[PDB]
C-alpha cells in the first residue's frame, strides 16, 4: 500500500511523484537508472512529458520493473504531457499516441496540457523563424480540451488535467459549454517561497488537486531560471526545522506540501536522495511548524517560461 488522493474523476493519484526532467547536458541514460531506483525506493507516481525527450528511457524503466515482477502496471501512476506544438485538436490524440509508442505503454494514467501558449505544428518543439522568433499559433484551448476529453473516453489517458494554468484559464475550462470532465489537477510551481495559497484555495474549491513542481527550488537550469534567485534549500528556517527533526530541508519542503493537501513532485537522479525523499511519509509537522513555513512566502517564481510571453494565454 501507499498514500494516494481521490481525483474528481474517481481515479487515485499517489501523493508523492518522481520528477524526470534533467537538463540537456545530462545524458538520457541517466533517466532509465533513476526511474528504476525511484520505483525500488517506493515511488508509485512518475512525471514526464514529450518535451523532456526521455520517454523511451522512462518507459523502458517502467516496463523493466513490471517485467521483472517488481511492480504491477496498476501500481504505477504515469503522467505525460501534451506539448504546445500539438494543441490543435486534431493533433492531440496523435501526440498522445506518439508518446505511448515511445513508452511502449498502453495508456497513461494522466495526460496534461503542458503549457497554455500554443506554437506551430511540426517536429520542432520550439519552432522558430529565420530570425529566431518563436512561431506562435492561435488555438482555442477549449477545443484542445474537448480533444483531451476524447482521449480519456478512449481509455488512452485514464485522467486529464492541466499545467501552468492561471485562475482565468482554469475558469475558461470549467465554464466551457458542454464540459464533460473537469481537469483533475493543475500542475504548477509551488514551494515555500511561492506557496500559491490563493490558487491552491481556488483549486480546492473546485476539487482540483494542485500538483507542485520545483518543490525543492527547481533544477535551476539556465537560461530558464535566474541564477540570482535565492536557493530554496538554503533557507535558514527550513534548515533549522531539518535539524530539529533530524531530516533535511528537502524533506521539510516536501512534507509541507503533503500536509497542506498538495501532491508533490521531487526530481533526483542521485541514489541516496531518491531514497531520502520517500522518507516524507515518516514524520509530521506541527501547526506551529506549518505556520513558520507559510511565513517564508516571498512571491519568488523560478520558472517564468518567459520565452513564451506576449500571446494572451501566457499565464504569468
Ligand atoms: N509542468 C511543468 O511545466 C513542469 C515544470 C518544472 C518541473 N516539472 C516537473 O517537476 C519535476 C521536479 O521539478 P524540478 O525538476 O524543477 O526539480 P525539483 O524537484 O525542485 O528539484 C530540484 C533539485 O533538487 C535536488 N534534490 C532532489 N532531492 C534532494 C534532496 N533530498 N536534498 C537535496 N537536493 C535534492 C535535485 O538534484 P539531484 O538530482 O542531484 O538529487 C534537483 O536538481 C521535474 O523533473 C518535472 O517532472 C514540471
Ligand atoms: C517547463 C517545461 C517543464 O519543465 O516541464 C519545459 C521543459 C523543457 C523545455 C525544453 C524544450 C526544449 C529544449 C530545452 C528545454 C521546455 F520548453 C519546457
Strand order of the biggest β-sheet: 3-4-5-6-7-8-9-10
What Rg do the Cα atoms give?
19 Å
Number of DSSP-assigned strands: 10
CATH architecture term: Alpha-Beta Barrel
Overall structural class, as computed from helix and strand content, comes to alpha/beta
Can you write the helix and strand succession as a string? EEEHEHEHEHEHEHEHHEHH
What is the distance, rounded to the nearest whole angstrom, between the alpha carbons of the first and last residues?
38 Å
Main pleated sheet: 8 strands, parallel, barrel
**In oligomeric terms, what are we looking at?**
monomer
Q: Please tally the helical runs, counting DSSP H or I stretches of 4 or more residues.
A: 10
Work out the count of structural domains.
Answer: 1
So what's the overall shape?
globular
Cofactors and ligands present?
NADP nicotinamide-adenine-dinucleotide phosphate, flurbiprofen
CATH-level-4 superfamily name: NADP-dependent oxidoreductase domain
Report the CATH C-level class.
Alpha Beta
What portion of residues is helical? 25-40%
β content, as a range?
A: 5-15%
Which fold does the CATH topology refer to? TIM Barrel
Account of the protein in words:
It contains ten helices and ten strands. β6 (108-113), α4 (141-153) and β7 (157-163) form a beta-alpha-beta unit. With 316 residues, it is α/β, with parallel strands linked by helices. α3 crosses α4 (141-153). The strands form two sheets. The chain has an eight-stranded parallel β-barrel, surrounded by four helices. The chain has a two-stranded antiparallel ribbon with strand order 1-2. It has helices at 29-41, 55-67, 89-103, 141-153, 167-174, 197-205, 236-245, 249-259, 271-277, 287-294, and strands spanning 4-6, 12-14, 16-19, 45-47, 77-82, 108-113, 157-163, 185-189, 209-213, 263-267. The longest helix has 15 residues, at 89-103. The protein has a single domain (1-316), classed as NADP-dependent oxidoreductase domain (TIM Barrel, Alpha-Beta Barrel). The radius of gyration is 19 Å and the shape is globular. 34% of the residues lie in helices and 15% in strands. NADP nicotinamide-adenine-dinucleotide phosphate (NAP) binds next to β10 and α9.
